[PDB]
Amino acid sequence: ELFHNLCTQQHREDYQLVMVCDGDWEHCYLPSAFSQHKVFVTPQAPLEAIQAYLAGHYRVPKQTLSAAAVFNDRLCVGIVASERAGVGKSLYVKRLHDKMKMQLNVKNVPLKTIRLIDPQVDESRVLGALLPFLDAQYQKVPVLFHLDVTSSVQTGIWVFLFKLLILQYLMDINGKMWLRNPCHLYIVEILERRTVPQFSFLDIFPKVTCRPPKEVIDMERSDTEPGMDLWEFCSETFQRPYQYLRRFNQNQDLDTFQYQEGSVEGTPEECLQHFLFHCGVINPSWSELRNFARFLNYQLRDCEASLFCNPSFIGDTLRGFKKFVVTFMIFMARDFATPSLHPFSLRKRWESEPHPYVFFNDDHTTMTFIGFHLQPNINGSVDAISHLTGKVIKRDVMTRDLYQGLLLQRVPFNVDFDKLPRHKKLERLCLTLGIPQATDPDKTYELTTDNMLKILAIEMRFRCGIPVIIMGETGCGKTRLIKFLSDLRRGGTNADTIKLVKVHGGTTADMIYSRVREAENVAFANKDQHQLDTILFFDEANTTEAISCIKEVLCDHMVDGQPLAEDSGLHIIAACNPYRKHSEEMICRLESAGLGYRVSMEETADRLGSIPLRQLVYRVHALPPSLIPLVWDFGQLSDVAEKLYIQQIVQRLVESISLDENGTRVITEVLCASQGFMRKTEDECSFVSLRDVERCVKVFRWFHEHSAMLLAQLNAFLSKSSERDPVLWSLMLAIGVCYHASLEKKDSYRKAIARFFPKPYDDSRLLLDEITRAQDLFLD
Numbered sequence: 039e040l041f042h043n044l045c046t047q048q049h050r051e052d053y054q055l056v057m058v059c060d061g062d063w064e065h066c067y068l069p070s071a072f073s074q075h076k077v078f079v080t081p082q083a084p085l086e087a088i089q090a091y092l093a094g095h096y097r098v099p100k101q102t103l104s105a106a107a108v109f110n111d112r113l114c115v116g117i118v119a120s121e122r123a124g125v126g127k128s129l130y131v132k133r134l135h136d137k138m139k140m141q142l143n144v145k146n147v148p149l150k151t152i153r154l155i156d157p158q159v160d161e162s163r164v165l166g167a168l169l170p171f172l173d174a175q176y177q178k179v180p181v182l183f184h185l186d187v188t189s190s191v192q193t194g195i196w197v198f199l200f201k202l203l204i205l206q207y208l209m210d211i212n213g214k215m216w217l218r219n220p221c222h223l224y225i226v227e228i229l230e231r232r233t234v235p236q237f238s239f240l241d242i243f244p245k246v247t248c249r250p251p252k253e254v255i256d257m258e259r260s261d262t263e264p265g266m267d268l269w270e271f272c273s274e275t276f277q278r279p280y281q282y283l284r285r286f287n288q289n290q291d292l293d294t295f296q297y298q299e300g301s302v303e304g305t306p307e308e309c310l311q312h313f314l315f316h317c318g319v320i321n322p323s324w325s326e327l328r329n330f331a332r333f334l335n336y337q338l339r340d341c342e343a344s345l346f347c348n349p350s351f352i353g354d355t356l357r358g359f360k361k362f363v364v365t366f367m368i369f370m371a372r373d374f375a376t377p378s379l380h381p382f383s384l385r386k387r388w389e390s391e392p393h394p395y396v397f398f399n400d401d402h403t404t405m406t407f408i409g410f411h412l413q414p415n416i417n418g419s420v421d422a423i424s425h426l427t428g429k430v431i432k433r434d435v436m437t438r439d440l441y442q443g444l445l446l447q448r449v450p451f452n453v454d455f456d457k458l459p460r461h462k463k464l465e466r467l468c469l470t471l472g473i474p475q476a477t478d479p480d481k482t483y484e485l486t487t488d489n490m491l492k493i494l495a496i497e498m499r500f501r502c503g504i505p506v507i508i509m510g511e512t513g514c515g516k517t518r519l520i521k522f523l524s525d526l527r528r529g530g531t532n533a534d535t536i537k538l539v540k541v542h543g544g545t546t547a548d549m550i551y552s553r554v555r556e557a558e559n560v561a562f563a564n565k566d567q568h569q570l571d572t573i574l575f576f577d578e579a580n581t582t583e584a585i586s587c588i589k590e591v592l593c594d595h596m597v598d599g600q601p602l603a604e605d606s607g608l609h610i611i612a613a614c615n616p617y618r619k620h621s622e623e624m625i626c627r628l629e630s631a632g633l634g635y636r637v638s639m640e641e642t643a644d645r646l647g648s649i650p651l652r653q654l655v656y657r658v659h660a661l662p663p664s665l666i667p668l669v670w671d672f673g674q675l676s677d678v679a680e681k682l683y684i685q686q687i688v689q690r691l692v693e694s695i696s697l698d699e700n701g702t703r704v705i706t707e708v709l710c711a712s713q714g715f716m717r718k719t720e721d722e723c724s725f726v727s728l729r730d731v732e733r734c735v736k737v738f739r740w741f742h743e744h745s746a747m748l749l750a751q752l753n754a755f756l757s758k759s760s761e762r763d764p765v766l767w768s769l770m771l772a773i774g775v776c777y778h779a780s781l782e783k784k785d786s787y788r789k790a791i792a793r794f795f796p797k798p799y800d801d802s803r804l805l806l807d808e809i810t811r812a813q814d815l816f817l818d
């Protein structure tokens with residue numbers, strides 16, 4: 039309407055106007071109105087021409103003091119891209135900032151970092167973050183803007199980059215406006231979202247492609263295809279493992295070798311070759327390789343500080359100790375470095391692999407051996423065997439001379455932590471962790487070898503600096519283990535050494551940032567007062583898209599672009615729920631419930647790509663690909679452990695209400711049978727946890743409390759239509775509420791459960807009868 043009206047009025051009679059539409063949607067209003075005007079010579083340019091055009095426009099003149107000076111050829115815009123995660127995009131921007139601080143002679147060169155976490159790009163948040171810089175001091179001073187477009191972003195990215203980088207502008211509801219100044223550099227950190235034409239939109243831009251180690255060796259210098267950073271290669275993390283490995287592979291004697299601080303040897307290429315050979319991953323990222331290096335460095339450092347490697351002090355009975363240490367630790371790293379996950383490419387199990395751990399205790403005089411035993415063979419060599427089955431885990435980890443020597447040193451080989459007493463377990467565990475006192479915080483937490491190994495894994499990751507991301511079902515033991523460890527390290531002190539955040543779909547980035555900053559203050563306080571490390575724990579973190587913020591906290595070690603303060607003692611753990619899909623029968627039952635769903639699986643926008651989330655047992659969003667190599671399974675809750683927790687709950691009830699042992703037995707057996715049946719019945723129940731047993735016990739307790747009145751009213755009601763144990767009766771009604779009602783195959787459940795009930799109540803019919811009578815009484 040307005041176009042036609044203006045054309046009727048005194049206007050530009052040579053106006054140049056263009057409209058552009060998506061052919062699939064072209065049937066709509068504005069393309070329809072001008073269909074006659076449809077232009078059939080669609081303008082196009084080859085990618086190289088657009089590249090040269092934008093590169094010319096981005097090029098900052100030499101006279102202009104610009105952050106661009108560091109970038110390729112004074113381009114005030116750059117894209118840093120990777121086909122996968124953790125290959126040096128943020129590192130590249132860091133080094134760019136540093137080089138800018140070196141070159142530009144400026145007292146301060148601001149870095150602004152912006153995280154785009156929302157699936158649909160929020161340009162108003164970007165504008166809000168940039169507006170502080172509208173001040174004039176910045177208009178003639180270099181500033182670097184780093185915009186990280188996390189994996190969480192799915193839509194709005196190309197439009198946003200077009201407007202900001204090309205149109206040089208952003209604008210909001212109120213009317214305040216951002217102008218992209220050429221004196222400032224813009225770098226976009228993005229993962230190449232390859233799925234679409236012969237060229238990706240990002241290619242139009244000055245791009246840096248950061249490459250992984252294997253691509254760095256194979257393909258290779260340039261600033262648009264960086265290799266191994268020299269500060270990292272010259273860092274202790276790479277150099278100690280590199281020097282040790284360099285000697286190891288050549289079969290040199292390490293009996294004398296000791297890494298001298300600040301030393302640097304070899305070349306980036308040889309270091310990468312050795313790391314990739316031993317790493318265990320075929321095409322690792324740089325993060326996986328640093329985690330490998332960081333682990334091997336920490337443990338080799340502790341070995342160097344130990345007495346078994348001190349100036350001899352033991353003669354030569356320990357010849358080959360460092361050779362053994364390097365071999366074993368390269369094997370041990372397999373658990374910490376290697377991924378455990380391989381639309382639903384995200385799954386594996388904990389019991390699938392051994393966890394042979396060796397630790398150097400903070401006393402620098404003892405070692406801890408867990409998860410494996412040493413067995414001598416006829417060939418004079420010593421092998422690593424599974425402590426459970428005795429099967430060989432790794433052959434020739436050491437020679438028999440070193441085994442006998444280490445025995446003479448009282449090193450605790452072949453220890454069976456499952457047969458040890460409680461306090462001996464606590465002593466070994468605390469010594470390994472570096473705790474002086476075996477202050478047992480929970481006698482019901484069973485310190486089995488597996489749980490101790492889990493604790494020690496979390497500990498090593500805390501020590502070296504590998505992020506801790508654990509995957510497990512609800513009630514598999516994560517929160518109790520973390521609590522146990524926090525309490526053990528606390529040692530009775532009155533301190534808040536652990537903060538637990540229960541993450542939900544509504545957990546926003548600002549909530550995570552605030553929680554982390556609060557935990558950081560709390561940790562500074564705790565370390566000052568009590569000298570205790572602090573844990574922050576995110577449970578159900580994948581449940582939110584703000585999980586990308588959690589990635590920043592775990593991997594990037596930052597908070598909304600601001601860095602985390604080391605010297606805090608704050609450790610972060612994240613627990614992610616698993617990625618499972620409901621069975622097809624179960625999805626049928628769900629789609630058939632009532633009038634069915636309001637939206638079909640096709641029309642949904644709530645999905646994990648191909649999968650609607652309602653078809654997932656857990657509403658979980660996709661993991662940032664950087665966290666994928668780090669997630670390790672906590673393990674499934676064993677039948678023995680389930681029964682033990684049920685027994686603990688029923689006994690807690692016994693003390694609360696003074697039941698007998700017969701009722702305890704029956705309640706335990708019926709709760710176990712109920713959980714078993716619901717687990718087997720994958721067509722009606724996909725989710726089973728101990729929270730359901732707590733709920734059923736709560737209901738049982740409620741029925742037991744009221745049982746006097748309910749049984750009186752029941753006898754009266756039934757007399758109107760002219761004996762019972764309160765415990766078995768309340769159990770039956772609790773079972774009714776928790777399991778029997780939601781079910782469709784109620785009869786099979788009652789048949790299974792009845793067998794555990796004492797006579798004469800061991801009948802499915804009596805069970806249904808009592809449930810019916812109680813329902814009637816409640817209607818009456």
Ligand SMILES: Nc1ncnc2c1ncn2[C@@H]1O[C@H](COP(=O)(O)OP(=O)(O)OP(=O)(O)O)[C@@H](O)[C@H]1O
Nearest residue numbers: 123124125126127128129266267270324325328664
């Ligand atoms: N030469 C190297 N190149 C890249 N990363 C390296 C190198 N040497 C060590 N690293 C480690 O790899 C990690 C790379 O993290 P970085 O912030 O670059 O990841 P990223 O490129 O942001 O990936 P994503 O955005 O997917 O997390 C750093 O923590 C760094 O310590």
Ligand SMILES: [Mg+2]
Nearest residue numbers: 127128227594
């Ligand atoms: Mg990054």
